[PDB]
Amino acid sequence: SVLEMENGYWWCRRKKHREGRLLKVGTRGDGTPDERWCFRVEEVNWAAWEKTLPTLSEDPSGP
């Protein structure tokens, strides 16, 4: 139903827009920047306390 309603009616062509925002992720992914449209899912995990994998940003600063 959602994928049908995105397309509009048969008399108006709804301009569908990109979902998610653009974060520069890597350095040498494609060129000196790379930019991928990404979508953020927030989760809470009480089992893992690693602080080992690097993260894209440092202050949280949600939505």
């Binding site: 995105e6 979902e19 992720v25 890597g26 899912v41 927030e42 995990n45 894209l56 949280p60």
Partner: protein
């Protein structure tokens, strides 16, 4: 290598969506490699604070903005009883 197409127009993310294969579909949708093999990943992690972590999943050709998205192929082009189990999993469920 990922964004290459066969004669039918599909790339191996979309091909696993169309043919009904869920087990490689989930892993292609959610792959995180730590180390020097960073740019060929999709489930990045933006930040963590104590137990809460926000992780940018990727939407290269998974959102219906594109012409032949995985969202369209799962709904309208897949002939399999495994259709709905692809929609349940993340990041498709939140999307």
């Amino acid at each position: 290598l990922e964004e290459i197409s066969n004669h039918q127009g599909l790339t191996p993310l979309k091909l696993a969506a169309k043919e009904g294969k869920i087990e490689i579909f989930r892993h292609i949708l959610q792959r995180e490699f730590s180390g020097p093999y960073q740019p060929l990943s999709r489930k990045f992690t933006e930040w963590c604070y104590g137990p809460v972590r926000v992780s940018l999943y990727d939407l290269s050709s998974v959102d219906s903005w594109e012409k032949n998205s995985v969202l369209e192929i799962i709904a309208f082009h897949c002939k399999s009883p495994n259709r709905h189990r692809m929609v349940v999993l993340e990041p498709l469920n939140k999307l």
